[PDB]
Enzyme design. Structure first.
Site, PDB file in Angstrom:
ATOM      1  N   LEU A  23       0.820  -1.199   0.000  1.00  0.00           N
ATOM      2  CA  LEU A  23       0.000   0.000   0.000  1.00  0.00           C
ATOM      3  C   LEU A  23       0.859   1.255   0.000  1.00  0.00           C
ATOM      4  CD1 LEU A  23      -2.945  -0.864   2.404  1.00  0.00           C
ATOM      5  CD2 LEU A  23      -2.914  -0.828  -0.038  1.00  0.00           C
ATOM      6  N   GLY A  26       7.193   4.484   3.192  1.00  0.00           N
ATOM      7  CA  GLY A  26       7.563   5.795   3.670  1.00  0.00           C
ATOM      8  C   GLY A  26       8.948   5.892   4.223  1.00  0.00           C
ATOM      9  N   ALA A  27       9.802   4.938   3.866  1.00  0.00           N
ATOM     10  CA  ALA A  27      11.195   4.787   4.354  1.00  0.00           C
ATOM     11  C   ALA A  27      11.353   4.255   5.781  1.00  0.00           C
ATOM     12  CB  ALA A  27      12.121   5.961   4.052  1.00  0.00           C
ATOM     13  N   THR A  30       7.225   0.163   5.532  1.00  0.00           N
ATOM     14  CA  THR A  30       6.338  -0.168   4.432  1.00  0.00           C
ATOM     15  C   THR A  30       5.032  -0.692   5.005  1.00  0.00           C
ATOM     16  OG1 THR A  30       8.094  -0.543   2.861  1.00  0.00           O
ATOM     17  CG2 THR A  30       6.033  -1.677   2.455  1.00  0.00           C
ATOM     18  N   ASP A 138      -2.646  15.558  15.304  1.00  0.00           N
ATOM     19  CA  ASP A 138      -2.363  15.452  13.885  1.00  0.00           C
ATOM     20  C   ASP A 138      -3.637  15.146  13.105  1.00  0.00           C
ATOM     21  OD1 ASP A 138      -0.849  15.614  11.598  1.00  0.00           O
ATOM     22  OD2 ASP A 138      -0.119  13.550  11.701  1.00  0.00           O
TER      23      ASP A 138
HETATM   24  C1  LIG Z   1      -4.536  10.163   2.871  1.00  0.00           C
HETATM   25  C2  LIG Z   1      -3.103   9.797   3.281  1.00  0.00           C
HETATM   26  C3  LIG Z   1      -2.800   8.342   2.948  1.00  0.00           C
HETATM   27  O1  LIG Z   1      -2.829   8.013   1.770  1.00  0.00           O
HETATM   28  N1  LIG Z   1      -2.560   7.455   3.816  1.00  0.00           N
HETATM   29  C4  LIG Z   1      -2.250   6.074   3.651  1.00  0.00           C
HETATM   30  C5  LIG Z   1      -1.693   5.524   2.476  1.00  0.00           C
HETATM   31  C6  LIG Z   1      -1.388   4.158   2.411  1.00  0.00           C
HETATM   32  C7  LIG Z   1      -1.617   3.319   3.509  1.00  0.00           C
HETATM   33  C8  LIG Z   1      -2.172   3.846   4.705  1.00  0.00           C
HETATM   34  N2  LIG Z   1      -2.421   3.059   5.872  1.00  0.00           N
HETATM   35  C9  LIG Z   1      -1.644   3.297   6.947  1.00  0.00           C
HETATM   36  O2  LIG Z   1      -0.989   4.320   7.050  1.00  0.00           O
HETATM   37  O3  LIG Z   1      -1.494   2.304   8.002  1.00  0.00           O
HETATM   38  C10 LIG Z   1      -0.359   2.261   8.864  1.00  0.00           C
HETATM   39  C11 LIG Z   1      -0.591   1.286  10.006  1.00  0.00           C
HETATM   40  C12 LIG Z   1      -0.617   1.765  11.327  1.00  0.00           C
HETATM   41  C13 LIG Z   1      -0.832   0.867  12.362  1.00  0.00           C
HETATM   42  C14 LIG Z   1      -1.014  -0.499  12.062  1.00  0.00           C
HETATM   43  F1  LIG Z   1      -1.234  -1.372  13.046  1.00  0.00           F
HETATM   44  C15 LIG Z   1      -0.977  -0.999  10.759  1.00  0.00           C
HETATM   45  C16 LIG Z   1      -0.782  -0.085   9.726  1.00  0.00           C
HETATM   46  C17 LIG Z   1      -3.580   2.246   5.926  1.00  0.00           C
HETATM   47  C18 LIG Z   1      -4.131   1.683   7.080  1.00  0.00           C
HETATM   48  C19 LIG Z   1      -5.287   0.896   6.952  1.00  0.00           C
HETATM   49  N3  LIG Z   1      -5.853   0.697   5.735  1.00  0.00           N
HETATM   50  C20 LIG Z   1      -5.309   1.264   4.618  1.00  0.00           C
HETATM   51  N4  LIG Z   1      -5.839   1.095   3.375  1.00  0.00           N
HETATM   52  C21 LIG Z   1      -5.576   1.648   2.139  1.00  0.00           C
HETATM   53  C22 LIG Z   1      -4.716   2.733   1.970  1.00  0.00           C
HETATM   54  C23 LIG Z   1      -4.716   2.986   0.601  1.00  0.00           C
HETATM   55  N5  LIG Z   1      -5.553   2.088   0.041  1.00  0.00           N
HETATM   56  C24 LIG Z   1      -5.993   1.837  -1.363  1.00  0.00           C
HETATM   57  N6  LIG Z   1      -6.130   1.205   0.984  1.00  0.00           N
HETATM   58  N7  LIG Z   1      -4.193   2.024   4.730  1.00  0.00           N
HETATM   59  C25 LIG Z   1      -2.465   5.231   4.733  1.00  0.00           C
END
Ligand SMILES: *CCC(=O)Nc1cccc(N(C(=O)OCc2ccc(F)cc2)c2ccnc(Nc3ccn(C)n3)n2)c1
Length: 304
Positions: A23, A26-27, A30, A138
């Site tokens: 998905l 971010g360095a 992932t 945030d």
């Molecule tokens: C609007 C800003 C943005 O795009 N954010 C973004 C992009 C890609 C993936 C995500 N996450 C995310 O940051 O999760 C981090 C995380 C934190 C704690 C944990 F236990 C596990 C993971 C994210 C979380 C959940 N679902 C999705 N789904 C997604 C994102 C993009 N697409 C098509 N589906 N993303 C946040």
């Protein structure tokens, strides 16, 4: 006067889940989308997996602390961590990504009923963070995730800080921050209301960048000068006057999240009286890759 945090932190074997697609990278790490198949239980759970890469582990583990301590339909909760060589956070997959991108990729099909319902849901989630004495620091449309077009949840607790029974920090997102937080680095629940205002504004403007083309250093002054973001075109004065109150400089004369729920809920009862949108339209509902007979959403998978 401070209660014991008896949340469970659940540790999961890396065997129980399968990454599926990146998905994001971010360095620091992932984030994958995958499935969580608990052992001999006959459920597949769509999840997001974030693995770090450091001494940044203090950061990823602090987020897991927060995310394990929240239980609300409008907040993202931690499903578990996995202690492989890479530490891994597992959470419920939000299929439609973040609200910021969703509002852009779908402007021509977002009706006022959707915009106002989202505003109610973010406010509910934020009010629940208040109840649990947590200060998000945030809040922005990019840290709101979309489980269905009808159902969003607040996310991103990296910066989030638990107050006792007025948090003093010292890298930030300036254009979403209360005045106090710029000059004194104070963050309150009312500091979150300011950011909530900017978030509502992002949604009404379908994702415009706040103060686009302005250098961040100037922002503290132009705000003291009595200046704020413009009235969005779809926005009646009713809606915009709520936004403007979030941006008042006396943080206590700003509104409370429980009041934003009431107000926006009243507006969502008659959407077209409050948001003027050409052609108020419909939005979508997802098996995707693998046999999906036993797929269970996280919100229906409750081991107590
Ligand atoms: C609007 C800003 C943005 O795009 N954010 C973004 C992009 C890609 C993936 C995500 N996450 C995310 O940051 O999760 C981090 C995380 C934190 C704690 C944990 F236990 C596990 C993971 C994210 C979380 C959940 N679902 C999705 N789904 C997604 C994102 C993009 N697409 C098509 N589906 N993303 C946040």
């Amino acid at each position: 006067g401070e209660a014991p945090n008896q949340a469970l932190l659940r540790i999961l074997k890396e065997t129980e889940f399968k990454k599926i697609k990146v998905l994001g990278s971010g360095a620091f790490g992932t984030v994958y989308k995958g499935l969580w198949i608990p052992e001999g239980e006959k459920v597949k759970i769509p999840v997001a997996i974030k693995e770090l890469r450091p001494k940044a582990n203090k950061e990823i583990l602090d987020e897991a602390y927060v995310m394990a301590s929240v239980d609300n339909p409008h907040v993202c909760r931690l499903l578990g961590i996995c202690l492989t060589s890479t530490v891994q956070l597992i959470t419920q997959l939000m299929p439609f990504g973040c609200l910021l991108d969703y509002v852009r990729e779908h402007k021509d099909n977002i009706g006022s009923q959707y915009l106002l319902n989202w505003c109610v849901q973010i406010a509910k989630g934020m009010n629940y963070l208040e109840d649990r004495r947590l200060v998000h620091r945030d809040l922005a449309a990019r840290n709101v995730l979309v489980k269905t077009p009808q159902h969003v949840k607040i996310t991103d607790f990296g910066l989030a800080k638990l107050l006792g029974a007025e948090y003093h920090a010292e890298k930030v997102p300036i254009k979403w921050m209360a005045l106090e937080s710029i000059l004194h680095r104070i963050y309150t629940h009312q500091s979150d209301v300011w950011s909530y205002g900017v978030t509502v504004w992002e949604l009404m403007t379908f994702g415009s960048k706040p103060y686009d083309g302005i250098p961040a250093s100037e922002i503290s002054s132009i705000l003291e000068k009595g200046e704020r973001l413009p009235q969005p075109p779809i926005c009646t004065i009713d809606v915009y006057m709520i936004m403007v109150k979030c941006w008042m400089i006396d943080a206590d004369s700003r509104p409370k999240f429980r009041e934003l729920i009431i107000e926006f809920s009243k507006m969502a009862r008659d959407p077209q009286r409050y948001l003027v949108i050409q052609g108020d339209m419909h939005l979508p509902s997802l098996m995707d890759e693998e046999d999906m007979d036993d797929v269970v959403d996280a919100d229906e998978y409750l081991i107590p």
